[PDB]
Write a protein that holds these residues in place. Structure first.
Motif, short mmCIF file in Angstrom:
data_model
loop_
_atom_site.label_atom_id
_atom_site.label_comp_id
_atom_site.label_asym_id
_atom_site.label_seq_id
_atom_site.Cartn_x
_atom_site.Cartn_y
_atom_site.Cartn_z
N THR A 105 0.82 -1.21 0.00
CA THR A 105 0.00 0.00 0.00
C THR A 105 0.86 1.26 0.00
N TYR A 106 1.93 1.27 0.80
CA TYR A 106 2.81 2.42 0.96
C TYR A 106 2.05 3.60 1.57
N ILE A 107 2.73 4.73 1.73
CA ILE A 107 2.13 5.92 2.34
C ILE A 107 2.05 7.09 1.37
N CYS A 108 2.58 6.95 0.15
CA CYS A 108 2.46 8.02 -0.83
C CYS A 108 1.00 8.26 -1.20
CB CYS A 108 3.29 7.69 -2.07
N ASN A 109 0.23 7.19 -1.35
CA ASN A 109 -1.18 7.29 -1.70
C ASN A 109 -1.92 6.08 -1.16
N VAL A 110 -3.25 6.18 -1.14
CA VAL A 110 -4.08 5.09 -0.65
C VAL A 110 -4.04 3.92 -1.64
N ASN A 111 -4.58 2.78 -1.19
CA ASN A 111 -4.70 1.56 -1.98
C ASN A 111 -3.35 0.88 -2.16
N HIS A 112 -3.36 -0.41 -2.50
CA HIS A 112 -2.15 -1.21 -2.59
C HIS A 112 -1.74 -1.36 -4.05
N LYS A 113 -0.59 -0.79 -4.40
CA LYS A 113 -0.02 -0.99 -5.72
C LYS A 113 0.75 -2.30 -5.78
N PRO A 114 0.93 -2.86 -6.97
CA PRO A 114 1.61 -4.16 -7.08
C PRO A 114 3.03 -4.11 -6.54
N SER A 115 3.42 -5.20 -5.87
CA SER A 115 4.75 -5.32 -5.29
C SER A 115 5.10 -6.80 -5.19
CB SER A 115 4.83 -4.65 -3.91
N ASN A 116 6.39 -7.07 -5.03
CA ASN A 116 6.90 -8.44 -4.98
C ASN A 116 6.93 -8.91 -3.53
N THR A 117 6.11 -9.92 -3.22
CA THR A 117 6.09 -10.51 -1.89
C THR A 117 5.52 -11.92 -2.02
N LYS A 118 6.38 -12.93 -1.86
CA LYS A 118 5.98 -14.32 -2.02
C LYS A 118 6.47 -15.14 -0.83
N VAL A 119 5.72 -16.19 -0.52
CA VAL A 119 6.12 -17.09 0.57
C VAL A 119 7.42 -17.80 0.23
N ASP A 120 7.55 -18.27 -1.02
CA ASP A 120 8.78 -18.91 -1.51
C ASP A 120 9.20 -20.07 -0.62
N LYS A 121 8.22 -20.86 -0.18
CA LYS A 121 8.49 -22.00 0.68
C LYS A 121 8.45 -23.31 -0.10
#
Ligand SMILES: CC(=O)N[C@@H]1[C@@H](O)[C@H](O)[C@@H](CO)O[C@H]1O
Lengths: 218, 209, 209
Positions: free
Chosen positions: A202-218
Motif C-alpha cells: 500500500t505504501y504511504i504516498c497514496n491510498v490503496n495497494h499498488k503491485p509489489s513483490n512478496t511471495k512465501v517462496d516455501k
C-alpha cells in the motif's frame, strides 16, 4: 445548507501545539456558535470549547486552561484550534460541531466535521517475506506482509485472489512505539507456500495497494 | 373573600402582581369618591360599599413599599327615597319601600362568564446570556417564545431554560406565559385566547333587593 | 458534575430498548441524544427531551422524570446499532458535558466464530528464528483476548500473542493478528499446539512439528 469542513490528518510528535482549522459556511453566520470537541478513540466525547462568530468569546473547558487557545478569521469564516503541551493520550479524534437545521438556538447541534484521527504515515514497506524450505504441515507462516513499515494502515495482500482466504490481517499494535504497520496475509497452505503470488504494497504516498513483490517462496 | 392559596379567608382582597397572586387584608384597602367610602363586604370579583355621590371613584391600598391607586370616571349617584331630597340618610322618619344592593353573596339569578385567559407577555423571561437571547420560564410553567430573527421561532414546549442563539437582541423575541388552568373573567382589557373560551358562569353577589 | 450512562445495553430485535441518563441538576436543563455510527460523526436523534428531527424514524422517543432521562427505541432492528450519548449543560450552563455512551447491540447475528486463521510458525520464518505466536480468528462472536499456546508444554501466555478486539465485516466482534514468538522453541518442542480458550470455547488444533 450548513457545510463545515476541517483540515486534513496531521500527525506530530508529543510536546508541541497542534493547529486544526475548521471552516463553516452555507448558512447565516452572524451569531451562531461552533463547538470544538475532542473524542478519544472508542471513548466518550469530551467537549472542549465554543466559539461565537460576532462575539469572538470562548468559554474553555474546566480541565484545560492556557494550553488551549482560540483563533478565528472572518475572511475564511474559519476557526483555528491550537493545543499546546500535547501528551500521548491527547492524540485523539477531533470534531467541529454546529447547528444544521433549526428548531431552536443552542443545545441543538446537528452538523459535525469528518474527523482528524491521525497515526504514523511515513512511506515504508517491505518486499519478499522469506525464502526457506516449506514445512511438513499444510500451512504457511510466511505471506504477503510488510515489516518495519510506517505506512498508515498499509494493507499487504497478494495481488491475485490466491492465498487471500484463510489469512488474518495483522494489526499495527505498535507495542515498542515503532509504527509496526503490518497486514500479514498467510497462504495457510503448504502447496500455496511453495508458489505464492506477489503481494501488493500500500505504501504511504497514496491510498490503496499498488503491485509489489512478496511471495512465501516455501 | 379568600386568599392566594385558594381557601376561605374572611375579609381579604386577592390581587395579581406580575403573575404572582398576592393578598392583603380588606381593611388595608380604601376607596373613595367626593368623600371617603366604607367597604361593606367583598365576594369574588365584586365589592359592596357605601359611597357618597361623586363624579369618579378611586381605589387605593398601600403595600409596605409602594401605593397602588386606580381612578375611573364612573359617576356615583346617591338616590334618596321618597319625596324629600336628602343627601345623608336620616336618623329618624318613616319606613318606605326601597331597592338597595343587599349584603348577601347567595346565588340569585344573575351571572357573568369565566373564560380561558389569553397568554400574557412577560419581558422579564427574556435575557441576554452570552450575547444571545435566553428564555428562562418560571418554575414549572411553559412559556411560548416567538422570535423574528434569522428563522422564525415559535418554540412553545419549553419548561426549564432555552437559549436561542439565532437572535442576538432581546427586543426581537417575545415570551408569553401560559396558564390555561385558572379561568379569568371575560374582561376587555385582556387578550382573547384562541378558539372556544367560555368555561363557566360566576354568580353575581350583592344584587339589588 | 457528570452524566451517568451505562457502558452498553443488550436488546433483541423487535422489542423496545431503554437507555438511562442521570444528573444532579438534570431536571433543570435539557438533554440531547446523539447517535454515533461506527466510524462516523454523532448525529442528533432526540432534542428537547421529547421530539425527533425530520428524517429520524418515529421509533425513537425520549422521556424525562426528574433525575432520570430515558431514551426508548421501539422495534429495534438491524441498523439501529450505534452509540447513544446524552449531553447537557452544567449547573452554571456555561460548559457542556456528554454521557459515557451506550453501545446498543443485538445478540442473535454473527453467532458463528468460524475461525480460519492458520499461523504455521513454519521453517520459512525459522531463517530469522522469529515465527508467528498464534492464529487469531478473523471473525468471532464476543471474542475474548485470551490465548495461551501450548507448544509441547503447559499452556503459557508467552507462547501466544493477543490483541484488542475489532469488528469483522461479517459483524462478528473479532480482530486478527499474525503475532510473534521464537521459532527455535517450536523446533525444539516435540509438538506445536495452540490453545485458544476464549468466548466460552476451548479447543486445540493439530500438534505436528
Ligand atoms: C420543569 C418541568 O416541570 N418540566 C415538566 C416536564 O415533565 C416536561 O418538560 C413537561 C411535559 O411536556 O412538563 C413539565
Amino acid at each position: 445548507q450548513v457545510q463545515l469542513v476541517q483540515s486534513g490528518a496531521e500527525v506530530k510528535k508529543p510536546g508541541a501545539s497542534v493547529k486544526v482549522s475548521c471552516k463553516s459556511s452555507g448558512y447565516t453566520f452572524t451569531n451562531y456558535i461552533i463547538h470544538w470537541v475532542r473524542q478519544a478513540p472508542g471513548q466518550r466525547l469530551e467537549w472542549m470549547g465554543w466559539i461565537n462568530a460576532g462575539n469572538g468569546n470562548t468559554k474553555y473547558s474546566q480541565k484545560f486552561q492556557g494550553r488551549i487557545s482560540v483563533t478565528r478569521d472572518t475572511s475564511a469564516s474559519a476557526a483555528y484550534m491550537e493545543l499546546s503541551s500535547l501528551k500521548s493520550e491527547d492524540t485523539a479524534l477531533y470534531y467541529c460541531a454546529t447547528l444544521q437545521m433549526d428548531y431552536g438556538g443552542n443545545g441543538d447541534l446537528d452538523y459535525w466535521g469528518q474527523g482528524t484521527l491521525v497515526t504514523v504515515s511515513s512511506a515504508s514497506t517491505k518486499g519478499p517475506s522469506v525464502f526457506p524450505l516449506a514445512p511438513s504441515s499444510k500451512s504457511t507462516s510466511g505471506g504477503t506482509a510488510a515489516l518495519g513499515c510506517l505506512v498508515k494502515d498499509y494493507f499487504p495482500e497478494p495481488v491475485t485472489v490466491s492465498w487471500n482466504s484463510g489469512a488474518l490481517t495483522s494489526g499495527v499494535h505498535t507495542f515498542p512505539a515503532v509504527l509496526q504497520s503490518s497486514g500479514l496475509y498467510s497462504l495457510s497452505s503448504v502447496v500455496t507456500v511453495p508458489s505464492s503470488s506477489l503481494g501488493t504494497q500500500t505504501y504511504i504516498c497514496n491510498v490503496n495497494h499498488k503491485p509489489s513483490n512478496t511471495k512465501v517462496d516455501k | 373573600g379568600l386568599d392566594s392559596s385558594g381557601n376561605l379567608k374572611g375579609r381579604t382582597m386577592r390581587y395579581d402582581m406580575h403573575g404572582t397572586i398576592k393578598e392583603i387584608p380588606l381593611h388595608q384597602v380604601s376607596l373613595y369618591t367626593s368623600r371617603p367610602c366604607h367597604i361593606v363586604d367583598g365576594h369574588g370579583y365584586f365589592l359592596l360599599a357605601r359611597c357618597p355621590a361623586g363624579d369618579s371613584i378611586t381605589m387605593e391600598f398601600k403595600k409596605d413599599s409602594v401605593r397602588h391607586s386606580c381612578s375611573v370616571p364612573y359617576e356615583v349617584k346617591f338616590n334618596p327615597v321618597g319625596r324629600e331630597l336628602y343627601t345623608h340618610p336620616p336618623e329618624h322618619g318613616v319606613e318606605q319601600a326601597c331597592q338597595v344592593y343587599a349584603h348577601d353573596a347567595q346565588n340569585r339569578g344573575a351571572y357573568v362568564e369565566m373564560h380561558l385567559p389569553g397568554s400574557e407577555v412577560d419581558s422579564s423571561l427574556v435575557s441576554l446570556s452570552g450575547s444571545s437571547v435566553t428564555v428562562t420560564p418560571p418554575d414549572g410553567t411553559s412559556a411560548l417564545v416567538e422570535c423574528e430573527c434569522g428563522g422564525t421561532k415559535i418554540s412553545e414546549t419549553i419548561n426549564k431554560t432555552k437559549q436561542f442563539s439565532q437572535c442576538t437582541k432581546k427586543e426581537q423575541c417575545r415570551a408569553y406565559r401560559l396558564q390555561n388552568d385558572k379561568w379569568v373573567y371575560n374582561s376587555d382589557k385582556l387578550p382573547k385566547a384562541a378558539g372556544a373560551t367560555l368555561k363557566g358562569k360566576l354568580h353575581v353577589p350583592f344584587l339589588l333587593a | 458534575y457528570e452524566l451517568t450512562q451505562p457502558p452498553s445495553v443488550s436488546v433483541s430485535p423487535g422489542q423496545t430498548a431503554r437507555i438511562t441518563c442521570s444528573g444532579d441538576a438534570l431536571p433543570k436543563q435539557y438533554v440531547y441524544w446523539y447517535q454515533q455510527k461506527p466510524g462516523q460523526a454523532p448525529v442528533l436523534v432526540i432534542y428537547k427531551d421529547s421530539e425527533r428531527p425530520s428524517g429520524i424514524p418515529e421509533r425513537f422517543s425520549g422521556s424525562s422524570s426528574g433525575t432520570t432521562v430515558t431514551l426508548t427505541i421501539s422495534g429495534v432492528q438491524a441498523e439501529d446499532d450505534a452509540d447513544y450519548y446524552c449531553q447537557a449543560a452544567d449547573s452554571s450552563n456555561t460548559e457542556y458535558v456528554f454521557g459515557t455512551g451506550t453501545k446498543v447491540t443485538v445478540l442473535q447475528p454473527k453467532a458463528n466464530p468460524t475461525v480460519t486463521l492458520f499461523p504455521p510458525s513454519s521453517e520459512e520464518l525459522q531463517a530469522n528464528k522469529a515465527t508467528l505466536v498464534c492464529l487469531i480468528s478473523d471473525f468471532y462472536p464476543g471474542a475474548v483476548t485470551v490465548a495461551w499456546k501450548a507448544d509441547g508444554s503447559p499452556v503459557k501466555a508467552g507462547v501466544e500473542t493477543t490483541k484488542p478486539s475489532k469488528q469483522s465485516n461479517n459483524k462478528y466482534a473479532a480482530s486478527s493478528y499474525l503475532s510473534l514468538t521464537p521459532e527455535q522453541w517450536k523446533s525444539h518442542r516435540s509438538y506445536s499446539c495452540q490453545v485458544t480458550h476464549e468466548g466460552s470455547t476451548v479447543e486445540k488444533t493439530v500438534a505436528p512439528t
